[PDB]
Each structure stands twice: as structure tokens, then as C-alpha cells.
Design a protein around this ligand. Sequence first.
Ligand SMILES: Oc1cccc(O)c1
Ligand SMILES: Oc1cccc(O)c1
Ligand SMILES: Oc1cccc(O)c1
Ligand SMILES: Oc1cccc(O)c1
Ligand SMILES: Oc1cccc(O)c1
Ligand SMILES: Oc1cccc(O)c1
Ligand SMILES: Oc1cccc(O)c1
Ligand SMILES: Oc1cccc(O)c1
Ligand SMILES: [Cl-]
Ligand SMILES: [Cl-]
Ligand code: NA
Ligand SMILES: [Zn+2]
Ligand SMILES: [Zn+2]
Lengths: 29, 29, 29, 29, 28, 29, 21, 21, 21, 21, 21, 21
Amino acid sequence: FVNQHLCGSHLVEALYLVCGERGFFYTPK
Amino acid sequence: FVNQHLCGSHLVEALYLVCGERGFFYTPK
Amino acid sequence: FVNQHLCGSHLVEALYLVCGERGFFYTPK
Amino acid sequence: FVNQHLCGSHLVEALYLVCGERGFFYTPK
Amino acid sequence: VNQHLCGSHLVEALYLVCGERGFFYTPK
Amino acid sequence: FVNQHLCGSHLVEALYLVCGERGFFYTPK
Amino acid sequence: GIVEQCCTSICSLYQLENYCN
Amino acid sequence: GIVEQCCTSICSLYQLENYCN
Amino acid sequence: GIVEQCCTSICSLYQLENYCN
Amino acid sequence: GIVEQCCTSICSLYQLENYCN
Amino acid sequence: GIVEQCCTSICSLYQLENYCN
Amino acid sequence: GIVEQCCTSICSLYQLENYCN
Ligand SMILES: Oc1cccc(O)c1
Ligand SMILES: Oc1cccc(O)c1
Ligand SMILES: Oc1cccc(O)c1
Ligand SMILES: Oc1cccc(O)c1
Ligand SMILES: Oc1cccc(O)c1
Ligand SMILES: Oc1cccc(O)c1
Ligand SMILES: Oc1cccc(O)c1
Ligand SMILES: Oc1cccc(O)c1
Ligand SMILES: [Cl-]
Ligand SMILES: [Cl-]
Ligand code: NA
Ligand SMILES: [Zn+2]
Ligand SMILES: [Zn+2]
């Protein structure tokens, strides 16, 4: 559970970087 | 200076924490 | 002990956002 | 002021790394 | 201080872009 | 291995703070 | 927009909740 | 301490508030 | 979901791009 | 340098790729 | 404070160590 | 490498300085 919490933290930062201007929706469930 | 870009990076991290399992949407436009 | 080291990095960033002006004490003891 | 808010966020991470086992107190006020 | 904060985000972007290739960070 | 990917993300941030002007070469393998 | 709303004045976690799904 | 409590299972923002000044 | 796909194996920035708007 | 180039204006991933080994 | 001192000019890790308890 | 050395056990700032240029 915590491992996934930490992984998600980095995931959103990677999404912010690659998606740039387009933006993104983050839905874990 | 890249202020808006740096600001966005931090907003995304705060949204991840705040929103939890609900997730969120990030649209920079 | 590296898992714990990584977790604490995120813990302090969450405390910073949650506590705001109040500030916080981080004592891993 | 967002610039101070963003600076504080990095300061907290630097303190976590330099202080190690000792921990630290963050009181912006 | 602005450049120092920017530099922190730069290394993180480099880490993700370069992958297992690794990268070189040299400000000077 | 995601655990190594996440660990390296924190390693680079620590290197950035410790090395400063000297800079560094980051090579995984 | 979140950027126009939160990048000059600090948004509380309470305000940020408006951007959750 | 906070590490034992919060690195084993996820702590909510309310639980983390317990450690503010 | 993205967690199941990317927290087990490393997703490259190319793969992640599929989750952008 | 990289800070001069990438902190005044935002560098794209292509420009950042320049620094990969 | 730490913010007045380290956000207006860059503090080295040596200077930051003063705020460890 | 740095990974094998520092992701299996915690490296101090002194050990990490070894990897600076
Ligand atoms: O010094 C900074 C850093 C990031 C955003 C900003 O408005 C100022
Ligand atoms: O207004 C803001 C901007 C960036 C991060 C944050 O938590 C709040
Ligand atoms: O339990 C945790 C651990 C790390 C960050 C966080 O927000 C919660
Ligand atoms: O698969 C992943 C997980 C977290 C961050 C990332 O860049 C890739
Ligand atoms: O120009 C920049 C500066 C910091 C991060 C980034 O992705 C781009
Ligand atoms: O003076 C500062 C401000 C923020 C981070 C840091 O390492 C130093
Ligand atoms: O360069 C360093 C390394 C470790 C601790 C410190 O205060 C400074
Ligand atoms: O051993 C490590 C691994 C990651 C960050 C760090 O400061 C030390
Ligand atoms: Cl992590
Ligand atoms: Cl910043
Ligand atoms: Na700007
Ligand atoms: Zn992490
Ligand atoms: Zn920042």
C-alpha cells in the first residue's frame, strides 16, 4: 500500500513532465 | 524565468496528496 | 533501511503542506 | 507568497537529508 | 535562489528523460 | 525494477545538493 | 484555472480539493 | 514514531496533522 | 489502471504519454 | 550552460535529451 | 528565520545543519 | 555502481560526494 503511494507520487510528476501543455487526468482506481 | 512551470510541478504533488483515491485533473490552460 | 529513508522524504513534504504556518517537528527517533 | 512557499518546500527536503537521524524543526514563523 | 530551485527540477527532468542512459549535469 | 527507479530519483536530488557547482555524472550501470 | 488561481497567492489544501475528481 | 506509524500503512492528512506544531 | 501497469514495471515516458489529455 | 538555457525559458524534452549520456 | 535567511540567498549544507536539532 | 551501493543501504552525504565531478 505505502509502496504504491510513493510510486504514485513519482508517477504524477512524470505525467506532468511528458504531458506538458495538454494536461492529464490521474485516476488510481 | 520558468516560474509557472515550477509552480505547476508543486501543485500536482499537493493535488496528489489532497485528492487521494479520487485522483484529479490537471489542465494548465 | 532504504525503504524507510525514501518514505521519510515524502513524509516531510506531506507535513510541510499539511501543517502550513504551524510548522512541524520531524524526529525519526 | 508562492515563491516563499515553493522555497520552503525545497528547504524541508534539504534539512531532511543533512540532518539525518537527528531530525529537525521547521518553524517559518 | 531562483536558479538553485530551477536546477533541482532540471536534474529530476533529466533523470526521467535519460532513463538507463544516465546523464551529465554541469552548471559551471 | 521500479524500486531501483524510485531510489535513483532521490539519489539524483541528493547528488545535486551535495555536488553543487561541481555537478556530476549519473550513470545507472 | 488552477494556475491563475494558485501561482501568485497560496491555495490552501481546502481550496485545492476543488480540483479533485 | 511517525516512521513506524506512517511507513507501514498510509497515514491520512488528518493523521499527519497530529505531528504539526 | 496506471498503478497496476507502472508501479510493477518501469513505464518509459513514451508509454506514459498515452495517459495525457 | 544548462541553467542559463533552461531556467530563463522552458526546455523541451529534445533539448533536455542533449544532456543524456 | 530560516526562510528570510535561506530563500533570499543560497544556504550551503553547512549553514543548514544549524537547524538540525 | 551508485545504485548497488546506495539503494541497498543508506549512503551518507559524505559517501555521495564521491560521485561528484
Ligand atoms: O523563486 C521562485 C520559484 C518558483 C516560482 C516563483 O514564483 C518564484
Ligand atoms: O498555491 C500553491 C502552489 C503550489 C503548491 C501549493 O501547495 C499551493
Ligand atoms: O503514510 C504516508 C507516507 C508518506 C507520505 C504520505 O503522505 C503518507
Ligand atoms: O513506472 C514508473 C513509475 C513511477 C515513475 C516513473 O517515471 C515510471
Ligand atoms: O526548463 C525546465 C526547467 C525545469 C524543468 C523542466 O522540465 C524544464
Ligand atoms: O537556500 C536554500 C533554499 C532551498 C534549498 C536549499 O538547499 C538551499
Ligand atoms: O558536505 C556536507 C556533507 C554532509 C553534511 C554536511 O553538513 C555537509
Ligand atoms: O542511499 C540513498 C538513497 C537515496 C537518497 C539518498 O540520500 C541516499
Ligand atoms: Cl520513493
Ligand atoms: Cl520551485
Ligand atoms: Na515566468
Ligand atoms: Zn520517492
Ligand atoms: Zn520546486
